[PDB]
């Protein structure tokens, strides 16, 4: 059979997306495809299981769906393990984002705007937790060790953040077959839209690290197409406005980074700039438009609440279907339960490529292996790759990333990953302190000790405190 | 013949040291050894030439000394070119340190303690000038290009700062035969003194980058000797006091860095810590003793004045000998004009090794070439090497530098070098701005623009201003 396990299936909307794509994929929608939905939160998990079963039934897909609260059961003999879990202690929080929002508030209380987890080239909210991301790294490493014994052939498809740090740590310290997933590359198609270019006529490539990728190749009709971006910056940038807090691809911050680095940052990379664009909310609004981007004290909590409500709606909807077996989720809520339309995410296409030799081009976090020759072979990069029955095949990255991207962006970001990994494995608070000593917002050493003490002293950080004792 | 050219011979005390060592070296004190003393400041140069001639005469050395204000004449057919020049416009300053002190004061005026040239892992006073060190890099690159045509076999022995940035820039952009010189390694012998160890019984090694070197090997009687340092930290560190502003080898800052990195920083590396030890003068005094080290608003100007007076004394002494040919400099001032004692610096031993196959172990700034396998081959490192008639031979660095030294110290410092080089060659103010955007002392972007504007607007920075226009 074929066993696909979603760890953290309590993440309802993502689980349903994964189930919808599987049921709408010919080579996978088979009675021999078993989808295990695993989580430690039964209310969330139950809702996801009920909605997934009904969704499949309305799609007339014969896939079998199994619910379990046992991590071992989900891993045992799995072919693909999708880690979308975001650990949180329910005694204190409703989601993982809620413990991040709390430590961040404590950071801001001590003078660290947007929390100590917001650093240069690393502003994406909820990416790291107290620098070392202890609970997320711990869970990923547990899964990696369990599957080396209970599922040696399985792919561990890491989606929970930090993808870069975690994929790197698992690869380096376990050798488990882990691949990091994030589709920040989807931003390029807007670039093409704004420049009036058929994306099918555009010869393009993107490369870098997770949330740190660059449009290294951008050609059209046999010539460099960046002069067309230059034209857009001059004529249409002054009139640019963000449609919502997430709209940053064509923002002044992206184009300023482009002017400096020589290539356009893509996707979340525009959020991960230097402190030039993020000193405060007013500065964010100059470089990102009226919302100030997403990673600020207004929009990040707002967005997290929108997720909380959206989650409860789905849970309530799961109670409704149990009461109204006749209602068709495909009809009542098409945007959540689409028919005949794939999500476009890479997770299920990846599985169909490995298991059914359906070759496809994807952007995945894997070891460099000389793809970017100026960087170590074992450093995990977000690279363009072709996946099929027999492995992941890296494309040649040409043109190479510019000299400035390497020395001012990729390398400082790679070192931060190494800092974070060292802080985890060493169990040494002094490494956490050294990271904050490189932090521009630090005014004194005593400040560093006190912000960490309060974070470590939060009631839901007992494990973290004992870990670093 | 043998032609040894001192570029910047106006640096009187160093020139006399170089001349004294040559005249006291058997294989070099020959009529066929010609010492060219070159500089653009005649008062300084004349004083150095007069004192050098008298010194040689009292040593009964037959070496010929030539004075010239022509850089070409000094380079033409030279066998070794010693660059100890520190450019400065005499219309405004008396030495190079005086233009550094002025820009630093402007930096502090804008909220950058110890000037924008003081950065993490880079606190040594007068090491870089406005980040890119324009006048020093320019002169070094001029010399390198002139000698590729007028002296292809010559060694360019770079002593003027920044040694790291300059040696790297010359190697990479000209391929001239440049080697960087600095004897920060001399600090190890004090470590041995304090621990009651015969330095001859100590199997030790040091490696890193310029002003960024580490005691990677420290063994005694067949065992790791660092436990003896551990003992010293516990028993004798509390009673440590600095003999003078330069005494930092056994300071609390050095031992704190040792506790973190696992190896003891050596020499000037103790000055080049994180901002933890340098937020302000009071913080410096906690981690360096009562003087607060040398790199502060009190001791750095004090020391520079001590150099000014010491320089004028020598110039006045040169006028005295012209009036009293009978006086013996060897007798009246033995510390400046020693007999039968070498300085211990590496410059002349290096020359005697290349030209006379007198093999010796030295610590020189040369391309890595796989010595530290985790770093690029072309990056200039301060390595232990054996020099003889036919090349520079790198020792094996064992134990390897610790993981923390690499990711928290060497790599961040190497990237800064790349930042500085990029700022020079690009002629792009935005690179200078990006460097300051990574600066913890920056509070806003407008601050960066204004501090650079005032620095660029200083009257003696016309060339620098036009360069970056």
3-state secondary structure chain B: CEEEEEECCCCHHHHHHHHHHHHCCCCCCCCCEEEEEECCCHHHHHHHHHHHHHHHHHHCCCCEEEEECCHHHHHCCCCEEEECCCCCCCCCCCCHHHHHHHHHHHHHHCCCCCCCCCECCECCCCCCCCCCCHHHHHHHHHHHHHHHHHCCCCEEEECCCCHHHHHHHHHHHHCCCEEEECCHHHHHHHHHHHCCCCHHHEEEEEEEECCEEEEEEEEECCEECHHHHHHHHHHCHHHCCCCCCCCCCCCHHHHHHHHHHCCCEEHHHHCCCCHHHCCCHHHHHHHHCCCCCCCCCCHHHHHHHHHHHHHHHHHHHHHHHHHCCCCCHHHHCCCCCCCCCCCCCCHHHHHHHHHHCCCEEEEEEEECCCCCCCCCCCCEEEEEEEEECCEEEECCCCCCCCHHHHHHHHHHHHHHHHHHHHHHHHCCHHHHHHHHHCCCCCCCHHHHHHHHHHHHHCHHHHHHHHHCC
Residues B340, B321 within the same domain = no
Residues B39, B119 within the same domain = no
Rounded to an integer, what distance in angstroms lies between the CA atom of residue A249 and that of residue A267? 6
Q: For chain A, how far is it from start to end, CA to CA, in angstroms?
A: 46
Task: Report the length, in residues, of chain A.
Answer: 469
Which among A412, A430, A438 has CB closest to B260?
Answer: A430
Cβ-based neighbour number of residue B307 at 10 Å: 14
Residues B430, B351 within the same domain = no
Residues B285, B352 within the same domain = no
Rounded to an integer, what distance in angstroms lies between the CA atom of residue B270 and that of residue B212? 8
Nearest CA in chain B to A279: B444
Q: Which residues contact B315 (CB under 8 A, 6 or more apart)?
A: B12, B43, B44, B47
Q: Say if residue B375 is exposed, middle or buried (CB neighbours under 10 Å; 0-12, 13-18, 19+).
A: middle
Residue B385 vs residues A176, B189, B353: alpha-carbon distances, Å:
42, 18, 12
C-alpha A29, offset from chain centre: 26
Buried b (16+ CB within 10 A) or exposed e, B237-274: eeebebeebebbbbbbbbbbbbebbbbbbbbbbbbbbb
Which among B404, B418, B437 has CB closest to A275?
Answer: B437
Q: Which residues contact B103 (CB under 8 A, 6 or more apart)?
A: B115, B116, B117, B129, B130, B455, B458, B461
Domain tally, chain B: 2
Cβ-based neighbour number of residue A145 at 10 Å: 14
Cβ-based interface (< 8 Å): residues of A facing B: 120, 259-260, 274-276, 279, 283, 374, 376, 403-404, 407-408, 411-412, 415, 418-419, 422, 430-431, 434, 437-445
The dihedral through the CA atoms of A124, A125, A131, A136 has a sign that is negative
Q: Which residues contact B351 (CB under 8 A, 6 or more apart)?
A: B4, B22, B28, B79, B80, B155
Cβ atoms A441, B442 nearer than 8 A: no
Task: Show the tokens assigned to A419.
Answer: 């800092």
Q: Which residues contact B41 (CB under 8 A, 6 or more apart)?
A: B10, B90
Strands B33-38 and B2-7, by their bridges, are: parallel
Rounded to an integer, what distance in angstroms lies between the CA atom of residue B428 and that of residue B328? 54
Instruction: Please give the torsion angle defined by the CA atoms of residues A331, A336, A340 and A344, in that order, rounded to the nearest 10 degrees.
Output: 170
Cβ atoms A443, B441 nearer than 8 A: no
Find, among B52, B1, B6, B99, the residue nearest to B336 by Cα.
B52
Cβ atoms A447, A110 nearer than 8 A: yes
CB hemisphere CA count around B62 (13 angstroms) = 7
Q: Which residues contact A61 (CB under 8 A, 6 or more apart)?
A: A22, A23, A24, A29
Cβ atoms B48, B66 nearer than 8 A: no
State which residues form the domain around B349. 1-84+328-358
Which among B120, B274, B437 has CB closest to A274?
Answer: B437
**Is A21 annotated as belonging to a binding site?**
no
Find, among B459, B439, B436, the residue nearest to B448 by Cα.
B436
Asked, as a colleague might, if the bond just before B206 is cis with ω within 30 of 0, I would say: no
Find, among A125, A127, A170, the residue nearest to A145 by Cα.
A170
The dihedral through the CA atoms of B321, B323, B327, B332 has a sign that is negative
C-alpha B429, offset from chain centre: 26
Which among A279, A407, A422 has CB closest to B419?
Answer: A407
Rounded to an integer, what distance in angstroms lies between the CA atom of residue B160 and that of residue B8? 9
Residues B163, B43 within the same domain = no
Rounded to an integer, what distance in angstroms lies between the CA atom of residue B35 and that of residue B3? 6
Rounded to an integer, what distance in angstroms lies between the CA atom of residue B76 and that of residue B16? 22
Angle at alpha carbon of residue A159, lines to A158 and A161, rounded to 5°: 105
Torsions phi, psi of A87, nearest 5? -60, 145
Torsions phi, psi of A270, nearest 5? -70, -30
- In the beta sheet, which residues pair with residue B223? B220
Cβ atoms A358, A386 nearer than 8 A: no
Residue that finishes a domain, picked among B358, B376, B399: B358
Cβ atoms A154, A78 nearer than 8 A: yes
**How far off is chain A from B313, nearest CA to CA, in Å?**
43
Cβ-based neighbour number of residue B213 at 10 Å: 29
Q: Which residues contact B301 (CB under 8 A, 6 or more apart)?
A: B101
- Token pair 């006028």 is found at B319
**How far off is chain A from B259, nearest CA to CA, in Å?**
10
Buried b (16+ CB within 10 A) or exposed e, A301-311: bebbeeeeeeb
Find, among B169, B175, B185, B157, the residue nearest to B384 by Cα.
B185
Find, among B191, B184, B245, B253, the residue nearest to B217 by Cα.
B191
Cβ-based interface (< 8 Å): residues of B facing A: 120, 259-260, 274-276, 279, 283, 374, 376, 403-404, 407-408, 411-412, 415, 418-419, 422, 430-431, 434, 437-445
Nearest CA in chain A to B420: A407
Residue that finishes a domain, picked among A308, A336, A358: A358
Rounded to an integer, what distance in angstroms lies between the CA atom of residue A143 and that of residue B172? 47
B183 is catalytic: yes
Task: Report the length, in residues, of chain B.
Answer: 469
Find, among A253, A203, A261, A233, the residue nearest to A411 by Cα.
A261
CB hemisphere CA count around B171 (13 angstroms) = 21
* Record: contact B411-A415, CB cut-off 8 A: yes
Residues B382, B348 within the same domain = no
Residue B176 vs residues B148, B166, B168, B170, B376: alpha-carbon distances, Å:
6, 12, 11, 7, 19
Taking contacts as CB-CB distances below 8 angstroms, the residues of chain B near A374 are 376
Find, among A406, A403, A121, the residue nearest to A274 by Cα.
A121
Find, among B200, B199, B175, B169, the residue nearest to B187 by Cα.
B199
- In the beta sheet, which residues pair with residue B365? B180, B382
Rounded to an integer, what distance in angstroms lies between the CA atom of residue A107 and that of residue A93? 18
Find, among B384, B387, B354, the residue nearest to B368 by Cα.
B384
Residues A306, A441 within the same domain = yes
Taking contacts as CB-CB distances below 8 angstroms, the residues of chain B near A442 are 275, 440
- Token pair 């380096």 is found at A172
Cβ atoms B131, B460 nearer than 8 A: no
Torsions phi, psi of B88, nearest 5? -160, 145
Residues B99, B71 within the same domain = no
Find, among A464, A454, A457, A459, the residue nearest to A109 by Cα.
A454
Which among B259, B418, B444 has CB closest to A407?
Answer: B418
CB hemisphere CA count around B105 (13 angstroms) = 10
Cβ atoms A167, A180 nearer than 8 A: yes
Task: Show the tokens assigned to A106.
Answer: 């404590």
Torsions phi, psi of B81, nearest 5? -115, 110
Rounded to an integer, what distance in angstroms lies between the CA atom of residue A328 and that of residue A339? 12
- In the beta sheet, which residues pair with residue B34? B3, B64
Residue A129 vs residues A120, A271, B204: alpha-carbon distances, Å:
15, 18, 41
* Record: contact A275-B442, CB cut-off 8 A: yes
Resolution in Å, one decimal place: 2.2
Task: Show the tokens assigned to A163.
Answer: 């993808």
**Is B278 annotated as belonging to a binding site?**
no
**Is A86 annotated as belonging to a binding site?**
yes
C-alpha A149, offset from chain centre: 27
Residue A183 vs residues A85, A188, A247, B342: alpha-carbon distances, Å:
18, 11, 15, 66
CATH classification at residue A345:
3.40.50.720
* Record: contact B439-A440, CB cut-off 8 A: yes
Asked, as a colleague might, if the bond just before B66 is cis with ω within 30 of 0, I would say: no
The dihedral through the CA atoms of A408, A412, A414, A415 has a sign that is positive
Rounded to an integer, what distance in angstroms lies between the CA atom of residue A379 and that of residue A367? 5
Rounded to an integer, what distance in angstroms lies between the CA atom of residue A176 and that of residue A434? 30
CB hemisphere CA count around B460 (13 angstroms) = 19
B93 is catalytic: no
**Is B39 annotated as belonging to a binding site?**
yes
Buried b (16+ CB within 10 A) or exposed e, A206-244: bbbbbbbbbbbbbebeeeebbebbeebbeeeeeebebee
Rounded to an integer, what distance in angstroms lies between the CA atom of residue A274 and that of residue A409? 9
Question: Can you give chain A as a three-state secondary structure string?
Answer: CEEEEEECCCCHHHHHHHHHHHHCCCCCCCCCEEEEEECCCHHHHHHHHHHHHHHHHHHCCCCEEEEECCHHHHHCCCCEEEECCCCCCCCCCCCHHHHHHHHHHHHHHCCCCCCCCCECCECCCCCCCCCCCHHHHHHHHHHHHHHHHHCCCCEEEECCCCHHHHHHHHHHHHCCCEEEECCHHHHHHHHHHHCCCCHHHEEEEEEEECCEEEEEEEEECCEECHHHHHHHHHHCHHHCCCCCCCCCCCCHHHHHHHHHHCCCEEHHHHCCCCHHHCCCHHHHHHHHCCCCCCCCCCHHHHHHHHHHHHHHHHHHHHHHHHHCCCCCHHHHCCCCCCCCCCCCCCHHHHHHHHHHCCCEEEEEEEECCCCCCCCCCCCEEEEEEEEECCEEEECCCCCCCCHHHHHHHHHHHHHHHHHHHHHHHHCCHHHHHHHHHCCCCCCCHHHHHHHHHHHHHCHHHHHHHHHCC
Cβ atoms B153, B76 nearer than 8 A: no
* Record: contact B412-A276, CB cut-off 8 A: no
Task: Show the tokens assigned to A239.
Answer: 């009139």
**How far off is chain A from B276, nearest CA to CA, in Å?**
6
Find, among B21, B62, B31, B26, the residue nearest to B337 by Cα.
B21
Residues B195, B271 within the same domain = yes
Residue B467 vs residues B92, B102, B132, B169, B418: alpha-carbon distances, Å:
20, 20, 11, 17, 19
Residues A3, A144 within the same domain = no
Q: Which residues contact B196 (CB under 8 A, 6 or more apart)?
A: none
Rounded to an integer, what distance in angstroms lies between the CA atom of residue A183 and that of residue A203? 19
Q: For chain B, how far is it from start to end, CA to CA, in angstroms?
A: 46
Cβ atoms B432, B424 nearer than 8 A: no
Cβ atoms B430, B110 nearer than 8 A: no
Find, among A88, A64, A416, A468, the residue nearest to A272 by Cα.
A416
Buried b (16+ CB within 10 A) or exposed e, A411-423: bbbbbbbbbbbbb
Residue that finishes a domain, picked among A341, A358, A375: A358
Asked, as a colleague might, if the bond just before A414 is cis with ω within 30 of 0, I would say: no
**How far off is chain B from A313, nearest CA to CA, in Å?**
43
Task: Point out the residues of A that are catalytic.
Answer: 183, 268
CA-based diameter of chain A, in Å? 64
Which of B445, B446, B447, B449 to substitute to test the interface with A, most A CBs within 10 Å? B445
Residue A466 vs residues A166, A184, A459, B53: alpha-carbon distances, Å:
21, 36, 12, 71
Residues B115, B257 within the same domain = yes
Cβ atoms A367, A172 nearer than 8 A: no
Q: Say if residue B326 is exposed, middle or buried (CB neighbours under 10 Å; 0-12, 13-18, 19+).
A: exposed
Residues A317, A412 within the same domain = yes
């Amino acid at each position: 059979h074929m066993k696909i396990s979603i760890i953290g299936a309590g993440s309802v909307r993502f689980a349903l997306q994964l189930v919808g794509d599987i049921a709408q994929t010919e080579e996978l929608s088979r009675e021999d495809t078993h989808i295990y939905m695993m989580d430690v939160h039964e209310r969330r998990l139950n809702a996801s299981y009920i909605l997934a079963r009904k969704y499949v039934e309305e799609l007339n897909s014969p896939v079998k769906i199994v619910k379990t609260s046992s991590l071992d059961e989900a891993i045992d003999g799995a072919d693909f393990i999708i880690n979308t879990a975001y650990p949180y202690d329910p005694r204190y929080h409703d989601s993982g984002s809620q413990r991040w929002d709390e430590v961040t508030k404590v950071g801001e209380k001590h003078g660290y705007y947007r929390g100590i987890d917001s650093q240069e080239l690393n502003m994406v909210s909820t990416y790291t937790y107290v620098l070392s991301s202890y609970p997320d790294m711990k869970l990923a490493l547990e899964i990696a060790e369990k599957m080396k014994k209970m599922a040696p052939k399985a792919y561990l498809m890491q989606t929970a953040n930090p993808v870069f740090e975690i994929t790197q740590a698992v690869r380096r310290w376990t050798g488990a077959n882990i691949v990091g997933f994030c589709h920040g590359v989807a931003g390029v198609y807007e670039v093409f839209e704004k420049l009036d270019l058929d994306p099918e006529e555009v010869d393009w490539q993107v490369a870098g690290v997770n949330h740190g990728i660059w449009l290294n190749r951008f050609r059209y009709r046999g010539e460099d197409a960046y002069p067309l971006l230059d034209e857009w910056i001059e004529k249409k940038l002054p009139e640019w406005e963000p449609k919502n807090p997430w709209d940053t691809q064509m923002s002044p911050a992206a184009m300023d980074m482009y002017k400096f680095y020589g290539m356009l940052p893509i996707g979340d990379t525009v959020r991960n700039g230097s402190w030039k664009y993020h000193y405060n909310l007013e500065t964010k609004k100059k470089w990102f438009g009226k919302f100030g981007g997403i990673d600020n004290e207004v929009e990040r909590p707002k967005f997290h609440e929108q997720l909380r409500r959206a989650r409860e709606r789905l849970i309530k909807l799961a109670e409704e279907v149990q009461q109204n077996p006749g209602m068709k989720l495909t009809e009542e809520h098409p945007e959540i339960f689409p028919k005949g339309k794939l999500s476009g995410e890479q997770h299920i296409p990846f599985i169909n490529a490995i298991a059914n030799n359906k070759r496809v081009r994807l952007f995945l976090n894997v070891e460099n292996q000389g793809t970017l020759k100026d960087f170590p072979d074992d450093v995990v990069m977000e690279l363009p790759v072709w996946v099929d029955c027999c492995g992941i095949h890296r494309e040649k990255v040409e043109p190479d990333l510019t000299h400035r991207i390497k020395i001012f962006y990729l390398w400082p970001r790679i070192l931060r990953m190494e800092w974070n990994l060292e802080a985890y494995i060493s169990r040494d608070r002094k490494v956490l302190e050294e990271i904050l000593i490189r932090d521009p917002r630090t005014k004194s050493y005593e400040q560093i000790v006190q912000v960490l003490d309060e974070i470590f002293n939060l009631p839901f950080n007992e494990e973290l405190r004992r870990y670093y004792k």
